[PDB]
Structure formats: C-alpha cells, structure tokens
Amino acid sequence: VSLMEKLKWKIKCIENKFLNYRLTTNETVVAETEYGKVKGVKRLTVYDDSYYSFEGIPYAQPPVGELRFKAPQRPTPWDGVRDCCNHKDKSVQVDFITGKVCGSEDCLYLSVYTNNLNPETKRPVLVYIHGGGFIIGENHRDMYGPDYFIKKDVVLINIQYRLGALGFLSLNSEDLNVPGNAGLKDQVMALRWIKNNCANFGGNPDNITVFGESAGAASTHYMMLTEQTRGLFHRGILMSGNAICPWANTQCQHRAFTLAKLAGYKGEDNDKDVLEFLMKAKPQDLIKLEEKVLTLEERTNKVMFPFGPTVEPYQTADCVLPKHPREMVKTAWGNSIPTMMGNTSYEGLFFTSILKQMPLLVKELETCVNFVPSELADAERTAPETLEMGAKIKKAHVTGETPTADNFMDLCSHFYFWFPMHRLLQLRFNHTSGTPVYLYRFDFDSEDLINPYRIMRSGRGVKGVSHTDELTYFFWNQLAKRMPKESREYKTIERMTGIWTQFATTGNPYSNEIEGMENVSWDPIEKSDEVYKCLNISDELKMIDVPEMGKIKQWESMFEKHRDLF
C-alpha cells in the first residue's frame, strides 16, 4: 500500500481518536451478565443519535501460553464491576495499510450496542461476524461502528475470534489436542454467551440473527452447519460467501511444519516437536511468516490462505467440522431457519489490485484450467478432461479473441462467489424443511461514501460494485462522514439497515415502510425454480432474474459426468 495512503490513514487514525473522545459522554451504565457486572458508556453519532456501548466483554479465557492453538475455555467470573468503556485489542494479524504486525493474543471479546437499555419489549438481536479471509479483522468501531444500526430498535453485537495460524493451526496427532478450527470454536462460545446474556441488554434470546460478510459469511454458514450451535439462533444472512466457497476451507495439516521451519525450527517433521516450537514462538513472528507458507503449486491451484477452517482429523468434545462442508449441509440444523443470501453486482472487481502486480494471471484464461474446481481437476491440470472443463469456463467469460482483465474479474465473481452460492442452494433444497431463502443483489455504486477495503483493493476512482462495497451502508467507519438525509447514500443506509432489521425481526425481509419497496414482491426461491429471482438493490429496488444465471449453469455443466460431486 502506497506511502500516500499510509500517511492519509495515519491522519484519519489521529482524527478518529479525537472524534471518539468528543462523541463520548459521562453517562455510564451498569448491566448484569452471567459472569458479573459490566460498565458501559453512552456515545454519540454524527447523525445526533446516541447509543449504549459495552466493549471488551470477554466470552473466553485469554488463549495464551498453554491455551494457544487450543479450543477456547469459558472465562473466569468476577465480583465487582468490569470496565467495558473501551475496546480491547484485535487478533494478532498483519495491518494491510502499514504492513506491520499488530494486535494481541488476548482478543476474545465481543461488543454490545443498543439505543435503549430498558426497552418496553425485548428486541431483535443481531450478531455480526467480520470477514477478512480468516486472517485479518476486528470488532473495533473505527471499522465496524453501530451508528447506523442503532437508529433501529435492535441489539447489535460484534464479535472477535482468533485469526490465522493462532486461530486455525491443525495437527494430525490425536495426542496433542490441536484438531483445528479454534477460531470457529471461538465463534461458537461467543454465540452461547449471546444466547445466555442478551436478555440483560434488552435482547430477545428467542429472536437472534447471525450475519457476516466474506470470511464472515463463511463463518455464519459454519455456525448454521455445526451441531455445536443447534437452536442457538433463528435467522442467518450470508453476505458474499458461504462454507463451500473454495477459499473457505483447506486441508492444512502439513503446513504447520512449513511454518515452524520458516520460524527457525531445527529438527524433524513430527507433530509433537513442531507443536512445542510453535508454542514458545513469538505471536508476531508466526503471523508475519504466514504469507510465505503456501507453495507455488498451491497458489497455482488457487489456495488462498495457508491456515483456515478444516475437516478435523479426529473428533473432540468441542469439534466443529467433523466432515467436509458439502457433507455437513446434508445434516444441518441451519437448513431449517429463515435465510437471506446475496452478492454484489461486480464481486471480482476486487482483484484489480492483485491483477496489477501480476499481469500474467490474465493469461490463465487462455485455457482456464486453473479455475476448474479442485475436486474435478487433475494435479498438473493437463488431463484432456481438465482442458475440457476449462473450455466451458472460457466460453462463459472470455468475450473476445484474447482474454481481458474484466473477463478475469468476471470469472472471479463466479469462481469465488456465485457458483458456490448456486451449489449450496441446490444441495440445501435436497435436505430442508422448506423454510424460505431470499436472494438479494447489491448494485449500488457510490464514491462519495467509502470504507477502508477500497484502500486495500486499490479501488480509488474505479466504477462498479466490488466485494465489500456494501459494508459502507451497514457500519460507520473512520473514513465515513455525515451525509445529507436526501442523499442517495443516506437513503441506501436506511434501506439496507431497514431490510436487515426487518428480516431479523420477522424472518421476512419485505416491508412497505421502506422507501422504494412499494411495487416489490419479494418471493423466496423454490427448488422448482430454473432461474433464481433476487431483489436488485440499486438507486431503485427491483425484483429481477439473477443476471449471472446463464454463466452459473455453464459452471454447473462441468459436473455433467460427475453429478455426485455437485
């Protein structure tokens, strides 16, 4: 990330600290939790609203020392008042602006926000799980401010969970009790705390909506799949992702050794000796070295991250993923709660930044073999069958004689997001009670209001609606400003936060109290449907046939002779 954006960020960081101070009040409040009393503070927003803020609430034991890499444990109770007027630190991770490691191993906290601590009826409880490829992210308000949401009468909760190797290291040896998915198990324990405590903040524990974006969407889906959380919440919103996306799980049991070796480990490849090195190593050193773990073979086959959600190699008491995600959909309790899913209109436009450092990647579309789903392609991607599947991908996205950068980002829309959505819907239909799933497509493009991911994807002065562009209309961030109430940006904030709160309350996302939804008839998808219908959210709200459908079906055709793998 460029020096200019570095300094620009530094200045906004300084600005945001002073704004946070100014927007704080002297009105402190004490709430009960099952672990003891917590002191919150009231804060202001730039739209002159106010909300009660409880930050730094622990839902787990700090996972340091002997707890590193292991499943979370319930926290120790206290008798007194815990100060929850300030944010805790984020999971150890690489800062995408600076490039330096930041955060702490003491990161297992959640935040609770609400405009009214003593409501006259118990309110819908919304739980946000942040994305960031399972390697970055936070529940800090300089990125995920509840300011827009607290206009509505809900209780909003933003959690943290362990990222990267510290969250998702996985070892085969059953004796060492590091099966993997510690970060997902963090998420589970946070949910159990929310189930059992949200009533003290005016939340209705029988009406809980979990939602997330990207890795947060995959997480939300994982929380809908595991037996660990059965009945814990009642609605889910999968924003631009799910658990059968190709980036959303990996078999990383060998990569522990690689990481130890990178960090100075001397000795042999056996799990015990590897684990002991990794347990004494500096958290920052391990996280700094994660970038280098993936081999060139793996990157070529589009493995995105070294460590992440995995099929655990043996079953433990706190086990979250005992089989591959596709196998888990077939027995998922989550299939039978109301669900909303959706994508932006140009998801892959995200990859522009990566495309600029690696022009050669566009030549991959010449045969498209590297984008054939892994389970179908052969090792070297050279089998005649593989070239044939590659060809169906190429016919679907390459528009001219020679492939373009837009052809590439278009393919990425489908490789990373739309095709996995299509596979999940169909698979889910075969194993569900028949609760509704609603589709949206977020199609609203603005450069007047932005979020920090635009800095990462080099999205300055770029048209079209990329992955993460929609977060801007759900959460306050330190790059935001106050928008006039007549502005198309403000209206979208209203529509977006309104639909989500509407879905959270009733399990049905439609309301005629939302501006623009007058002639909207938003039906759930049926298994009988050959064509998906979605609400397309632009300046106007319009029900349309999913535009990506024809390409979606092309991808499906690659499974013609392998319908069992679909």
**396 phi, psi to nearest 5 deg:** -80, -25
Q: Which residues of 34-60 are buried (b: 16+ CB within 10 A; e: fewer)?
A: ebeebebbbbebeeeebbbbbbbbbbb
Distance (Å, rounded) from C-alpha 203 to C-alpha 126? 9
Number of domains in the chain: 1
Q: Active-site residue among 91, 214, 219, 413? A: 214
Sole residue written with tokens 């089989």 = 323
Q: Identify which of 166, 13, 182, 186 has the alpha carbon closest to the alpha carbon of residue 92.
A: 166
Neighbours of 155 (CB within 10 A): 30
Classified as helix, coil or strand, 15 is helix
Active site residue 214: yes
Degrees, nearest 5: CA angle 464-467-468: 110
Cβ neighbours for 441, distance < 8 A, ≥ 6 positions apart: 342, 343, 344, 345, 534, 535, 536, 537, 544, 546, 547
Distance (Å, rounded) from C-alpha 49 to C-alpha 454? 27
H/E element, 410: helix 405-413
Active site residue 347: yes
Q: Active-site residue among 234, 290, 467, 548? A: 467
Degrees, nearest 5: CA angle 193-110-289: 120
Q: Identify which of 394, 407, 295, 408 has the alpha carbon closest to the alpha carbon of residue 354.
A: 408
Neighbours of 8 (CB within 10 A): 14
Q: What is the DSSP letter of 91?
A: B
Sole residue written with tokens 């917590």 = 38
Q: Which residues of 64-90 are buried (b: 16+ CB within 10 A; e: fewer)?
A: eeeebbbbbeebeeeeeebebbebbbb
Give the 3-state DSSP-derived string for 224-237, with helices as H, strands as E and coil as C.
HHCHHHCCCCCEEE
Q: Identify which of 287, 273, 359 has the alpha carbon closest to the alpha carbon of residue 94.
A: 287
> And the tokens for 144?
């995920």
Pairing of strands 24-31, 93-94: unpaired
Q: Which residues of 434-464 are buried (b: 16+ CB within 10 A; e: fewer)?
A: eebbbbbbbbbbbeebbbbbbbbbbbeeeeb
Q: Which residues of 523-541 are buried (b: 16+ CB within 10 A; e: fewer)?
A: ebbeeeeeebbbbbbbeeb
Resolution of this deposited model, Å:
2.1
> And the tokens for 155?
């209780």
The residues with which 533 forms a beta bridge, in sequence order, are: 545
Pairing of strands 123-129, 109-114: unpaired
Q: Fill in the amino acid letter for 131.
A: G
Distance (Å, rounded) from C-alpha 351 to C-alpha 450? 17
Classified as helix, coil or strand, 543 is strand
Sign of dihedral through CA atoms 280, 285, 291, 295?
Answer: negative
- Determined by which method? X-ray
Distance (Å, rounded) from C-alpha 538 to C-alpha 556? 28
> And the tokens for 162?
């362990």
Active site residue 414: no
Distance (Å, rounded) from C-alpha 146 to C-alpha 112? 9
CB 426 within 8 A of CB 355: no
Cα 204 to Cα 209, 431, 480: the distances in Å are 11, 29, 31
CB 444 within 8 A of CB 492: yes
Distance (Å, rounded) from C-alpha 99 to C-alpha 481? 26
Q: Identify which of 187, 184, 190, 245 has the alpha carbon closest to the alpha carbon of residue 214.
A: 245
Q: Fill in the amino acid letter for 179.
A: P
Q: Which residues of 332-357 are buried (b: 16+ CB within 10 A; e: fewer)?
A: bebbebbbbbbbbbbbbbbbbeebee
Q: Active-site residue among 105, 347, 494, 548? A: 347
CB 75 within 8 A of CB 58: yes
Any idea what the CATH number is for the domain that residue 5 is in?
3.40.50.1820
Contacts for 4-8: CB closer than 8 Å, 24+ residues apart? 5/97, 5/455, 6/97, 6/98
**116 phi, psi to nearest 5 deg:** -155, 115
Neighbours of 267 (CB within 10 A): 12
Which domain, by its residues, includes 9?
1-566
Distance (Å, rounded) from C-alpha 371 to C-alpha 358? 16
Distance (Å, rounded) from C-alpha 427 to C-alpha 327? 10
CB 277 within 8 A of CB 263: yes
Pairing of strands 339-344, 437-442: parallel
CA atoms within 13 A on the CB side of 35: 19
